[PDB]
Write a protein that binds this ligand. Structure first.
Ligand SMILES: CC(C)(C)c1cc(NC(=O)Nc2cccc3ccccc23)c(N2CCS(=O)(=O)CC2)s1
Ligand SMILES: CCCCCCCCO[C@@H]1O[C@H](CO)[C@@H](O)[C@H](O)[C@H]1O
Length: 332
């Protein structure tokens, strides 16, 4: 068992193996940057805030540990290490997750570097490639936005989740559908792509309803085919009510852009989630020809998420989490 050291940073106390040197903060769980002296790389250290405070928190802790432990893909955040100062289940009350410190997010990049069409292909290609994998394990990200996209000096990308979100949220979510499928993440990708091509936020609404309004003027009022899947009378009227803005046409919002780019965007920003293009199909799209390769776009191992439909006590969630820490095996 490694020897630990203690440190207080922005009134928050950190307890790490001596291996992790030079803790400097970078967010508030809270997160630090450190030097992993084992490999000479800078890493990010997440220390969970109040991990087992309530049944909900405790499940959320177990979840996040399970997710990270599973993600083994180049375009998705992976676990380098998880540790705890605790010598035993009984002492156990802090959890720390370690990952590769990626340089900067997609927001930081766009601000002082002005993307080429070639940049957009490679970047969107990587999100998509990460998603095919994600989605293959029956996981839905749900909060894709440029702050959740890490990009290194070589403009190579990882998807993660730092726990405005709304500009990229699928509309079915802003109307509260409960069902949700995987192509909510495809809507988010089209909001991200849009902005990369235009340099402006596609749906900058002052509130969720103003955004629904701008969503509907561009993509169009729901077609009979779609309204047919909406069980609720009050839902069916309200969507017609928000589609009263003068109709705006797609291809005139994206005028200087590669014609294949606009085509792909028309296939992701489809109102009916059932007719929206999936990550797997998107990768084969002719906009990604310089990059697509089907022998190098894997899917994930089976991910046992039976825990998600479970209600257990705090101490059970905690004991489960503690097993996942002990059993962790790092990558070589
Ligand atoms: C698999 C997928 C979809 C990409 C998810 C990743 C994460 N976690 C993640 O990106 N972790 C980290 C972020 C930033 C720095 C870190 C630094 C070190 C370690 C982890 C770090 C998910 N969750 C669950 C929902 S939640 O409980 O609201 C928020 C977090 S879901
Ligand atoms: C303001 C815009 C109107 C929102 C209607 C968008 C319809 C989105 O698509 C719908 O999403 C559901 C996701 O659970 C699916 O189960 C439905 O079958 C699908 O048609």
């Amino acid at each position: 068992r490694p020897t630990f050291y203690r440190q207080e940073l922005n009134k928050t106390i950190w307890e790490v193996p001596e291996r992790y040197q030079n803790l400097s903060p970078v967010g508030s769980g809270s997160v630090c940057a450190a030097f992993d002296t084992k490999t000479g790389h800078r890493v990010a250290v997440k220390k969970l805030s109040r991990p087992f405070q309530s049944i909900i928190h405790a499940k959320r802790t177990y979840r996040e540990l399970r997710l990270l432990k599973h993600m083994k893909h180049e375009n998705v955040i992976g676990l380098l290490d998880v540790f705890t100062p605790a010598r035993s289940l009984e002492e156990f009350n802090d959890v720390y997750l370690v990952t590769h410190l990626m340089g900067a997010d997609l927001n930081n990049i766009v601000k002082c570097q002005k993307l080429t069409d070639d940049h957009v292909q490679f970047l969107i290609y990587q999100i998509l490639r990460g998603l095919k994998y994600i989605h293959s394990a029956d996981i839905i990200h749900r909060d894709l936005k440029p702050s959740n996209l890490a990009v290194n000096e070589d403009c190579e990308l990882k998807i993660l989740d730092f726990g405005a979100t709304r500009w990229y949220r699928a509309p079915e979510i802003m109307l509260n559908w409960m069902h949700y499928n995987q192509t909510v993440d495809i809507w988010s990708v089209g909001c991200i792509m849009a902005e990369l091509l235009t340099g402006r936020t596609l749906f900058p609404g002052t509130d969720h309803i103003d955004q629904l309004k701008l969503i509907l003027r561009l993509v169009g009022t729901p077609g009979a085919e779609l309204l047919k899947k909406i069980s609720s009378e009050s839902a069916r009227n309200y969507i017609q009510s928000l589609a009263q803005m003068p109709k705006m046409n797609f291809a005139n919002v994206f005028i200087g852009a590669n014609p294949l780019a606009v085509d792909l965007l028309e296939k992701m920003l489809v109102l009916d989630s059932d007719k929206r293009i999936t990550a797997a199909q998107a990768l084969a799209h002719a906009y990604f020809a310089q990059y697509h390769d089907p022998d190098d776009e894997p899917v994930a191992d089976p991910y046992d998420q039976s825990f998600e439909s479970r209600d257990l006590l705090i101490d059970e969630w905690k004991s489960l989490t503690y097993d996942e820490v002990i059993s962790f095996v790092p990558p070589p």
